[PDB]
Structures are given as C-alpha cells and as structure tokens.
Tab-separated table of N, CA, C and O in Angstrom:
chain	number	residue	atom	x	y	z
A	1	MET	N	-64.773	-65.112	69.425
A	1	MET	CA	-64.750	-63.909	68.540
A	1	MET	C	-66.152	-63.597	68.011
A	1	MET	O	-66.632	-62.474	68.176
A	2	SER	N	-66.805	-64.585	67.392
A	2	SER	CA	-68.101	-64.357	66.751
A	2	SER	C	-69.145	-63.897	67.761
A	2	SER	O	-69.742	-62.835	67.620
A	3	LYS	N	-69.331	-64.685	68.803
A	3	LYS	CA	-70.232	-64.303	69.889
A	3	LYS	C	-69.969	-62.868	70.323
A	3	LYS	O	-70.916	-62.089	70.501
A	4	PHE	N	-68.681	-62.521	70.443
A	4	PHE	CA	-68.248	-61.150	70.781
A	4	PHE	C	-68.786	-60.069	69.817
A	4	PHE	O	-69.298	-59.038	70.269
A	5	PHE	N	-68.675	-60.308	68.508
A	5	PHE	CA	-69.169	-59.361	67.507
A	5	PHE	C	-70.673	-59.370	67.345
A	5	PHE	O	-71.239	-58.354	66.907
A	6	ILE	N	-71.324	-60.483	67.707
A	6	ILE	CA	-72.792	-60.608	67.582
A	6	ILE	C	-73.526	-59.517	68.366
A	6	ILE	O	-74.531	-59.015	67.904
A	7	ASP	N	-72.994	-59.135	69.528
A	7	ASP	CA	-73.560	-58.045	70.353
A	7	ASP	C	-72.816	-56.715	70.217
A	7	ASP	O	-73.062	-55.773	70.968
A	8	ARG	N	-71.907	-56.655	69.249
A	8	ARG	CA	-71.104	-55.479	68.963
A	8	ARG	C	-71.024	-55.306	67.432
A	8	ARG	O	-69.926	-55.305	66.854
A	9	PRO	N	-72.198	-55.150	66.771
A	9	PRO	CA	-72.259	-55.113	65.321
A	9	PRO	C	-71.638	-53.873	64.687
A	9	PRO	O	-71.379	-53.901	63.494
A	10	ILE	N	-71.457	-52.794	65.450
A	10	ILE	CA	-70.788	-51.576	64.934
A	10	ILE	C	-69.294	-51.852	64.834
A	10	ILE	O	-68.700	-51.615	63.783
A	11	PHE	N	-68.708	-52.365	65.918
A	11	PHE	CA	-67.301	-52.787	65.926
A	11	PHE	C	-67.057	-53.642	64.697
A	11	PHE	O	-66.129	-53.381	63.920
A	12	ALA	N	-67.919	-54.640	64.511
A	12	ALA	CA	-67.834	-55.521	63.350
A	12	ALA	C	-67.779	-54.716	62.058
A	12	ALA	O	-66.871	-54.889	61.249
A	13	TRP	N	-68.732	-53.805	61.913
A	13	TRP	CA	-68.803	-52.868	60.780
A	13	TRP	C	-67.517	-52.085	60.574
A	13	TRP	O	-67.044	-51.960	59.440
A	14	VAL	N	-66.966	-51.565	61.662
A	14	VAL	CA	-65.765	-50.744	61.597
A	14	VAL	C	-64.542	-51.509	61.068
A	14	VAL	O	-63.829	-50.961	60.214
A	15	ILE	N	-64.290	-52.737	61.552
A	15	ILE	CA	-63.163	-53.514	61.005
A	15	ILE	C	-63.386	-53.699	59.486
A	15	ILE	O	-62.430	-53.620	58.688
A	16	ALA	N	-64.646	-53.905	59.099
A	16	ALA	CA	-65.005	-54.037	57.692
A	16	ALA	C	-64.797	-52.747	56.904
A	16	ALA	O	-64.283	-52.793	55.773
A	17	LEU	N	-65.196	-51.611	57.496
A	17	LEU	CA	-65.006	-50.297	56.868
A	17	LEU	C	-63.530	-49.940	56.754
A	17	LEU	O	-63.099	-49.481	55.683
A	18	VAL	N	-62.765	-50.159	57.827
A	18	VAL	CA	-61.293	-50.001	57.772
A	18	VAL	C	-60.696	-50.846	56.625
A	18	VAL	O	-59.976	-50.323	55.770
A	19	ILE	N	-61.004	-52.131	56.577
A	19	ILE	CA	-60.538	-52.947	55.446
A	19	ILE	C	-60.876	-52.325	54.079
A	19	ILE	O	-60.040	-52.293	53.186
A	20	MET	N	-62.110	-51.859	53.921
A	20	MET	CA	-62.575	-51.297	52.641
A	20	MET	C	-61.881	-49.990	52.323
A	20	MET	O	-61.382	-49.794	51.221
A	21	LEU	N	-61.886	-49.089	53.290
A	21	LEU	CA	-61.247	-47.812	53.120
A	21	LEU	C	-59.794	-48.005	52.692
A	21	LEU	O	-59.358	-47.416	51.716
A	22	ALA	N	-59.060	-48.858	53.386
A	22	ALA	CA	-57.658	-49.089	53.023
A	22	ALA	C	-57.480	-49.734	51.634
A	22	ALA	O	-56.784	-49.209	50.790
A	23	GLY	N	-58.114	-50.871	51.402
A	23	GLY	CA	-58.033	-51.552	50.100
A	23	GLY	C	-58.528	-50.718	48.930
A	23	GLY	O	-58.016	-50.832	47.815
A	24	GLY	N	-59.539	-49.886	49.199
A	24	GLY	CA	-60.066	-48.932	48.233
A	24	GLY	C	-58.982	-47.971	47.818
A	24	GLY	O	-58.550	-47.994	46.663
A	25	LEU	N	-58.508	-47.175	48.781
A	25	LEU	CA	-57.383	-46.255	48.581
A	25	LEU	C	-56.195	-46.908	47.863
A	25	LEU	O	-55.567	-46.280	47.021
A	26	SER	N	-55.924	-48.170	48.138
A	26	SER	CA	-54.906	-48.910	47.384
A	26	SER	C	-55.102	-48.958	45.864
A	26	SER	O	-54.137	-49.054	45.122
A	27	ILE	N	-56.333	-48.926	45.388
A	27	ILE	CA	-56.561	-48.952	43.940
A	27	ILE	C	-56.041	-47.657	43.257
A	27	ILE	O	-55.722	-47.684	42.072
A	28	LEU	N	-55.907	-46.556	44.005
A	28	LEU	CA	-55.316	-45.305	43.492
A	28	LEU	C	-53.775	-45.280	43.407
A	28	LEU	O	-53.192	-44.252	43.065
A	29	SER	N	-53.110	-46.388	43.715
A	29	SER	CA	-51.659	-46.512	43.500
A	29	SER	C	-51.226	-47.731	42.678
A	29	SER	O	-50.090	-47.777	42.230
A	30	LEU	N	-52.099	-48.725	42.523
A	30	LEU	CA	-51.756	-49.942	41.810
A	30	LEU	C	-51.606	-49.592	40.358
A	30	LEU	O	-52.445	-48.879	39.819
A	31	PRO	N	-50.516	-50.048	39.726
A	31	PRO	CA	-50.450	-49.892	38.277
A	31	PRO	C	-51.346	-50.924	37.578
A	31	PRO	O	-51.663	-51.977	38.151
A	32	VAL	N	-51.771	-50.590	36.366
A	32	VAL	CA	-52.627	-51.463	35.587
A	32	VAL	C	-51.792	-51.906	34.415
A	32	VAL	O	-51.155	-51.073	33.792
A	33	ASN	N	-51.772	-53.193	34.112
A	33	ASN	CA	-51.111	-53.694	32.889
A	33	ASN	C	-51.800	-54.952	32.417
A	33	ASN	O	-52.600	-55.489	33.131
A	34	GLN	N	-51.524	-55.408	31.207
A	34	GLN	CA	-52.272	-56.538	30.653
A	34	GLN	C	-51.881	-57.795	31.415
A	34	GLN	O	-52.689	-58.335	32.180
A	35	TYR	N	-50.631	-58.220	31.228
A	35	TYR	CA	-50.059	-59.354	31.935
A	35	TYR	C	-48.943	-58.813	32.859
A	35	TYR	O	-48.419	-57.715	32.627
A	36	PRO	N	-48.577	-59.564	33.914
A	36	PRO	CA	-47.408	-59.213	34.755
A	36	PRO	C	-46.095	-59.489	34.025
A	36	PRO	O	-46.127	-59.884	32.864
A	37	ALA	N	-44.950	-59.250	34.658
A	37	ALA	CA	-43.681	-59.297	33.895
A	37	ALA	C	-43.337	-60.723	33.710
A	37	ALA	O	-42.782	-61.314	34.615
A	38	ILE	N	-43.664	-61.313	32.570
A	38	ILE	CA	-43.463	-62.740	32.469
A	38	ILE	C	-42.349	-63.144	31.562
A	38	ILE	O	-41.955	-64.271	31.603
A	39	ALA	N	-41.799	-62.242	30.771
A	39	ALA	CA	-40.692	-62.645	29.866
A	39	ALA	C	-39.346	-62.784	30.615
A	39	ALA	O	-38.969	-61.914	31.388
A	40	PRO	N	-38.608	-63.862	30.372
A	40	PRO	CA	-37.288	-63.952	30.987
A	40	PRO	C	-36.415	-62.758	30.624
A	40	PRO	O	-36.397	-62.378	29.450
A	41	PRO	N	-35.685	-62.180	31.600
A	41	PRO	CA	-34.797	-61.079	31.248
A	41	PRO	C	-33.766	-61.506	30.233
A	41	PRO	O	-33.370	-62.662	30.225
A	42	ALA	N	-33.358	-60.568	29.394
A	42	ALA	CA	-32.335	-60.806	28.345
A	42	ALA	C	-31.351	-59.629	28.189
A	42	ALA	O	-31.672	-58.483	28.476
A	43	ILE	N	-30.143	-59.926	27.746
A	43	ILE	CA	-29.168	-58.885	27.553
A	43	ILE	C	-28.643	-59.099	26.160
A	43	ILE	O	-28.338	-60.235	25.791
A	44	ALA	N	-28.545	-58.009	25.399
A	44	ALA	CA	-27.960	-58.023	24.057
A	44	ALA	C	-26.618	-57.339	24.086
A	44	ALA	O	-26.495	-56.253	24.664
A	45	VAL	N	-25.641	-57.961	23.439
A	45	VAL	CA	-24.335	-57.386	23.188
A	45	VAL	C	-24.195	-57.134	21.664
A	45	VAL	O	-24.367	-58.054	20.877
A	46	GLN	N	-23.853	-55.907	21.258
A	46	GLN	CA	-23.771	-55.515	19.838
A	46	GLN	C	-22.559	-54.695	19.400
A	46	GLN	O	-22.229	-53.683	19.995
A	47	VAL	N	-21.983	-55.104	18.274
A	47	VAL	CA	-20.763	-54.531	17.693
A	47	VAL	C	-20.904	-54.609	16.199
A	47	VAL	O	-21.193	-55.678	15.647
A	48	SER	N	-20.686	-53.472	15.552
A	48	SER	CA	-20.403	-53.425	14.120
A	48	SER	C	-18.873	-53.455	13.928
A	48	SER	O	-18.129	-52.680	14.559
A	49	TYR	N	-18.422	-54.386	13.101
A	49	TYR	CA	-17.055	-54.447	12.594
A	49	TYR	C	-17.084	-54.194	11.068
A	49	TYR	O	-17.153	-55.156	10.292
A	50	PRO	N	-17.023	-52.906	10.636
A	50	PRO	CA	-17.332	-52.566	9.234
A	50	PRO	C	-16.387	-53.224	8.203
A	50	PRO	O	-15.150	-53.072	8.276
A	51	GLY	N	-16.985	-53.996	7.293
A	51	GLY	CA	-16.274	-54.562	6.143
A	51	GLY	C	-15.750	-55.980	6.240
A	51	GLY	O	-15.016	-56.435	5.351
B	202	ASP	N	11.089	-50.192	9.730
B	202	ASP	CA	10.643	-50.439	8.332
B	202	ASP	C	9.817	-51.718	8.236
B	202	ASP	O	8.872	-51.807	7.450
B	203	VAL	N	10.192	-52.702	9.041
B	203	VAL	CA	9.497	-53.963	9.034
B	203	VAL	C	8.103	-53.760	9.642
B	203	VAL	O	7.138	-54.286	9.099
B	204	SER	N	7.982	-52.994	10.731
B	204	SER	CA	6.677	-52.832	11.367
B	204	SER	C	5.732	-52.125	10.428
B	204	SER	O	4.627	-52.628	10.142
B	205	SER	N	6.204	-50.978	9.927
B	205	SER	CA	5.460	-50.145	8.963
B	205	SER	C	5.014	-50.962	7.777
B	205	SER	O	3.902	-50.780	7.270
B	206	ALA	N	5.901	-51.851	7.335
B	206	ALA	CA	5.616	-52.744	6.233
B	206	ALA	C	4.548	-53.774	6.603
B	206	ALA	O	3.549	-53.902	5.890
B	207	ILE	N	4.768	-54.501	7.703
B	207	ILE	CA	3.794	-55.493	8.217
B	207	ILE	C	2.391	-54.851	8.348
B	207	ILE	O	1.374	-55.440	7.970
B	208	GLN	N	2.348	-53.631	8.872
B	208	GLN	CA	1.085	-52.896	8.990
B	208	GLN	C	0.457	-52.617	7.650
B	208	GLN	O	-0.756	-52.749	7.492
B	209	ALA	N	1.286	-52.193	6.700
B	209	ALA	CA	0.841	-51.948	5.331
B	209	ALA	C	0.192	-53.154	4.613
B	209	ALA	O	-0.880	-53.011	4.053
B	210	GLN	N	0.832	-54.325	4.657
B	210	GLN	CA	0.395	-55.523	3.904
B	210	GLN	C	-0.336	-56.592	4.718
B	210	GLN	O	-0.334	-57.776	4.353
B	211	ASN	N	-0.949	-56.178	5.822
B	211	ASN	CA	-1.700	-57.085	6.695
B	211	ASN	C	-2.755	-56.261	7.392
B	211	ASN	O	-2.638	-55.952	8.568
B	212	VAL	N	-3.771	-55.881	6.635
B	212	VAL	CA	-4.793	-54.987	7.138
B	212	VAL	C	-6.086	-55.273	6.391
B	212	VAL	O	-6.156	-55.064	5.176
B	213	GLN	N	-7.098	-55.755	7.117
B	213	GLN	CA	-8.405	-55.936	6.524
B	213	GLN	C	-8.933	-54.606	5.998
B	213	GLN	O	-9.130	-53.648	6.759
B	214	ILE	N	-9.147	-54.599	4.680
B	214	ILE	CA	-9.712	-53.472	3.929
B	214	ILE	C	-11.233	-53.584	3.912
B	214	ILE	O	-11.786	-54.651	3.596
B	215	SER	N	-11.901	-52.478	4.240
B	215	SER	CA	-13.334	-52.510	4.504
B	215	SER	C	-14.093	-53.052	3.293
B	215	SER	O	-14.728	-54.106	3.386
B	216	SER	N	-13.976	-52.363	2.158
B	216	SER	CA	-14.616	-52.776	0.892
B	216	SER	C	-16.158	-52.777	1.011
B	216	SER	O	-16.747	-53.626	1.690
B	217	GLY	N	-16.798	-51.818	0.348
B	217	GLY	CA	-18.228	-51.572	0.522
B	217	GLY	C	-19.201	-52.547	-0.140
B	217	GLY	O	-19.013	-53.769	-0.147
B	218	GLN	N	-20.272	-51.974	-0.674
B	218	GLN	CA	-21.354	-52.726	-1.291
B	218	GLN	C	-21.498	-52.354	-2.772
B	218	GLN	O	-21.257	-51.202	-3.177
B	219	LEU	N	-21.926	-53.344	-3.555
B	219	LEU	CA	-22.034	-53.243	-5.014
B	219	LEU	C	-23.488	-53.064	-5.386
B	219	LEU	O	-24.163	-54.004	-5.760
B	220	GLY	N	-23.953	-51.831	-5.293
B	220	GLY	CA	-25.375	-51.502	-5.393
B	220	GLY	C	-25.933	-50.844	-4.144
B	220	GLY	O	-27.146	-50.889	-3.919
B	221	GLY	N	-25.066	-50.217	-3.344
B	221	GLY	CA	-25.458	-49.645	-2.064
B	221	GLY	C	-26.447	-48.514	-2.232
B	221	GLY	O	-27.019	-48.325	-3.304
B	222	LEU	N	-26.639	-47.741	-1.179
B	222	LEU	CA	-27.667	-46.720	-1.217
B	222	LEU	C	-27.121	-45.309	-0.973
B	222	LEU	O	-26.283	-45.107	-0.083
B	223	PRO	N	-27.542	-44.341	-1.791
B	223	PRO	CA	-28.475	-44.541	-2.903
B	223	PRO	C	-27.878	-45.298	-4.093
B	223	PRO	O	-26.678	-45.610	-4.125
B	224	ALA	N	-28.750	-45.598	-5.047
B	224	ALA	CA	-28.369	-46.273	-6.286
B	224	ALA	C	-29.019	-45.613	-7.504
B	224	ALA	O	-29.891	-44.751	-7.373
B	225	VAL	N	-28.576	-46.027	-8.688
B	225	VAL	CA	-29.142	-45.542	-9.952
B	225	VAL	C	-30.450	-46.287	-10.227
B	225	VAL	O	-30.555	-47.491	-9.944
B	226	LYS	N	-31.432	-45.565	-10.773
B	226	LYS	CA	-32.796	-46.085	-10.961
B	226	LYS	C	-32.750	-47.405	-11.734
B	226	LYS	O	-32.110	-47.489	-12.773
B	227	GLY	N	-33.380	-48.438	-11.184
B	227	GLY	CA	-33.242	-49.805	-11.695
B	227	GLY	C	-32.220	-50.607	-10.899
B	227	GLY	O	-32.445	-50.895	-9.717
B	228	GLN	N	-31.107	-50.971	-11.544
B	228	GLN	CA	-30.044	-51.830	-10.961
B	228	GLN	C	-30.555	-53.214	-10.557
B	228	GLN	O	-30.098	-54.223	-11.101
B	229	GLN	N	-31.425	-53.251	-9.548
B	229	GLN	CA	-32.072	-54.479	-9.059
B	229	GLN	C	-31.148	-55.506	-8.359
B	229	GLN	O	-31.628	-56.278	-7.516
B	230	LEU	N	-29.848	-55.505	-8.690
B	230	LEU	CA	-28.865	-56.431	-8.119
B	230	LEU	C	-27.837	-55.694	-7.250
B	230	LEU	O	-27.003	-54.938	-7.762
B	231	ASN	N	-27.931	-55.940	-5.939
B	231	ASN	CA	-27.050	-55.398	-4.904
B	231	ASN	C	-26.316	-56.571	-4.222
B	231	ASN	O	-26.915	-57.619	-3.982
B	232	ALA	N	-25.030	-56.400	-3.919
B	232	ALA	CA	-24.251	-57.455	-3.264
B	232	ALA	C	-23.027	-56.929	-2.515
B	232	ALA	O	-22.362	-55.990	-2.957
B	233	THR	N	-22.725	-57.558	-1.383
B	233	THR	CA	-21.543	-57.193	-0.603
B	233	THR	C	-20.292	-57.637	-1.379
B	233	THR	O	-20.298	-58.664	-2.057
B	234	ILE	N	-19.244	-56.831	-1.307
B	234	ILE	CA	-17.989	-57.135	-1.976
B	234	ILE	C	-17.008	-57.414	-0.850
B	234	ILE	O	-16.691	-56.527	-0.079
B	235	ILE	N	-16.576	-58.656	-0.706
B	235	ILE	CA	-15.622	-59.001	0.375
B	235	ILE	C	-14.196	-58.826	-0.170
B	235	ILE	O	-13.801	-59.506	-1.108
B	236	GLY	N	-13.431	-57.907	0.412
B	236	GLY	CA	-12.015	-57.735	0.062
B	236	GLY	C	-11.150	-58.866	0.596
B	236	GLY	O	-11.644	-59.960	0.888
B	237	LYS	N	-9.850	-58.618	0.715
B	237	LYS	CA	-8.961	-59.578	1.389
B	237	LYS	C	-9.107	-59.400	2.914
B	237	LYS	O	-9.396	-58.294	3.392
B	238	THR	N	-8.951	-60.490	3.662
B	238	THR	CA	-8.746	-60.399	5.113
B	238	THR	C	-7.245	-60.549	5.395
B	238	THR	O	-6.461	-60.881	4.510
B	239	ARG	N	-6.862	-60.290	6.635
B	239	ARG	CA	-5.456	-60.286	7.068
B	239	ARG	C	-4.697	-61.602	6.782
B	239	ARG	O	-5.314	-62.648	6.633
B	240	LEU	N	-3.366	-61.544	6.733
B	240	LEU	CA	-2.510	-62.734	6.498
B	240	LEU	C	-2.747	-63.808	7.532
B	240	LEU	O	-3.306	-63.538	8.576
B	241	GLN	N	-2.297	-65.023	7.240
B	241	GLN	CA	-2.511	-66.187	8.147
B	241	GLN	C	-1.307	-67.094	8.386
B	241	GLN	O	-1.034	-67.481	9.518
B	242	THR	N	-0.610	-67.454	7.324
B	242	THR	CA	0.500	-68.382	7.435
B	242	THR	C	1.787	-67.655	7.686
B	242	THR	O	1.931	-66.498	7.311
B	243	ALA	N	2.736	-68.369	8.276
B	243	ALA	CA	4.113	-67.900	8.388
B	243	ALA	C	4.670	-67.499	7.023
B	243	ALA	O	5.412	-66.521	6.930
B	244	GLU	N	4.279	-68.219	5.967
B	244	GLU	CA	4.863	-68.034	4.621
B	244	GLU	C	4.420	-66.717	4.020
B	244	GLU	O	5.249	-65.970	3.493
B	245	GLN	N	3.123	-66.427	4.123
B	245	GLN	CA	2.575	-65.102	3.751
B	245	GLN	C	3.318	-63.939	4.423
B	245	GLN	O	3.534	-62.889	3.801
B	246	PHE	N	3.694	-64.144	5.689
B	246	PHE	CA	4.482	-63.158	6.465
B	246	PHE	C	5.892	-63.030	5.964
B	246	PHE	O	6.422	-61.935	5.903
B	247	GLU	N	6.485	-64.159	5.587
B	247	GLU	CA	7.835	-64.184	5.036
B	247	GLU	C	7.939	-63.476	3.710
B	247	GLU	O	9.026	-63.276	3.240
B	248	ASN	N	6.817	-63.041	3.155
B	248	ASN	CA	6.776	-62.484	1.823
B	248	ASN	C	6.408	-61.001	1.684
B	248	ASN	O	6.648	-60.411	0.652
B	249	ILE	N	5.776	-60.423	2.690
B	249	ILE	CA	5.492	-58.967	2.736
B	249	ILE	C	6.683	-58.036	2.462
B	249	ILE	O	7.181	-57.369	3.363
B	250	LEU	N	7.048	-57.942	1.186
B	250	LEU	CA	8.137	-57.101	0.668
B	250	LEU	C	8.451	-55.751	1.349
B	250	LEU	O	7.552	-54.973	1.635
B	251	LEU	N	9.747	-55.474	1.528
B	251	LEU	CA	10.248	-54.299	2.248
B	251	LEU	C	10.776	-53.221	1.301
B	251	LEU	O	10.435	-52.048	1.446
C-alpha cells in the first residue's frame, strides 16, 4: 500500500480530502451538549387523593 | 335502605386545612385537619343505624 501511494501522492491526497470533506460536513449535523445522556431513565407515577 | 345507609356512614370526608390559602394577615399557624376515615371492624358495620 505505502509503496503504492509513494509514487501516487495525489491519490493519497484525495483519500485524505474525501475523509476531511465528509467528517467536516458531519460537524453541521452533530448536536452539541455538555455531557451525553448519562442519567438512568426514571418513571414517576402520581395521584392526588384529596383529604 | 341498607346500601344507601352504608354509603352514608362509611365515607372518607375530605376535611381541609386550618390556615389554608388565602389567610388573614398574621395567623402564622397552619395545619391539616384529618377527619374520620372509613369504617374497619365488623362491629362498626353492625352499628350504622338505619
């Protein structure tokens, strides 16, 4: 592989540019948040029985 | 008559709060007032007058 790219440095560049272009564009869809969803899910059940 | 009666004398009455909101200026002492809860013993049932 390496020997192959050593005499084909544009090809090498292109796989690199494709990687960048794609991963770059990915930053325009990733949501941003402080921490990931780390709290255990919980369910509350609630009833008022007046008096 | 017995059902209507049983319903009448075996019913948790809500009974509010003693100092609820709004209140008169001051007061300072608020407390829940617990009424009676429903009957429990066979004997209490034997007594619900008709």
